[PDB]
Amino acid sequence: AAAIGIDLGTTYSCVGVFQHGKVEIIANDQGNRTTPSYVAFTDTERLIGDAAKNQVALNPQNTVFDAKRLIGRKFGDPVVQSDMKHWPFQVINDGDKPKVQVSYKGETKAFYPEEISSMVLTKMKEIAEAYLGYPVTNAVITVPAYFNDSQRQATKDAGVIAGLNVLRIINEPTAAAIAYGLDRTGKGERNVLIFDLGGGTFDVSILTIDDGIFEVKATAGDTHLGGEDFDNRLVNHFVEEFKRKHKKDISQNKRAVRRLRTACERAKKTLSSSTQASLEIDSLFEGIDFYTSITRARFEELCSDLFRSTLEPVEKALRDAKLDKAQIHDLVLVGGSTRIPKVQKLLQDFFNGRDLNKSINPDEAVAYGAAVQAAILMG
Ligand SMILES: Nc1ncnc2c1ncn2[C@@H]1O[C@H](COP(=O)(O)OP(=O)(O)O)[C@@H](O)[C@H]1O
């Protein structure tokens, strides 16, 4: 009766299980090894994951995402007040706690962040159970190192709502280190840097590990820098391209923009493996198809400042930890955006040619470690 490890991500979640002496990252029903942290409400259905993200352009007011930004926070939290301004869904105040408010089956309903995240966790649980062939009841769930007691509590509550006994809540960078077996070291402090550039957030963590004991020495980053911002640079580029070619501005058609955004994310992923990608959108605007392409070099240029901006938080973290570059024993890549070759070059160059740990898909490393830790806690 295996326990599972779940990365409850800002933009994508991932689930793994340790059995038969190895971790298996589990693909969902569509074959995807990570699942959007999306929940949608319609006149007839509640959709979660791929199904929810796949109709986000159609249903912006009732498709919820970014619940991780709300979870465990008070309504009057400056972070909440700030983030609310840029979401298409309504956030309301219930006793100084935020709720997301939507239309569902024709009625106005509101949900706590931990309710939305419970739905994502249920999906991840079900993905695992489909693979294992039996019900899962124990899990380790991960959170950012900077999460406070309230954020951790709300995340655990999300797990319990999903029918999971939460064995432990552990930090995302700790989980990534565990994935690479860095917890197995003996007596003697090792310094580990986790470079996590995900879908919506950028987190640099410096850990010391000593005889299997973890300590957080420094954290740095940007909570609004991630893969979606690279998607956005491509969107703006292609909006201009469409304008020049067709003399039409699509920028205020929310559907067109959202659909373009989706196609840009796809092309971006392809550019991590190939030096060019083709974008082909049928009926992008007024029935006009948009078939074009983008090179890796052009993509890099469009994002050059954003990519470069990831290094100063590394510098800052090193300063705070009172360590020189040469004193870092291991460099660990986390988050889907670290699969971008230019990002890898920047970090490697900054560390004067050091190896990067990147053999585990970086968007799966957190779940991988959580799965290992879950197995350890089960015995
Ligand atoms: N091969 C790839 N190349 C570039 N970006 C990728 C790749 N795979 C996933 N991504 C991006 O990674 C981001 C999601 O990162 P992930 O680690 O899965 O989740 P999160 O940061 O939400 O925990 C998205 O912006 C997605 O487009």
Ligand SMILES: [Cl-]
């Ligand atoms: Cl705990």
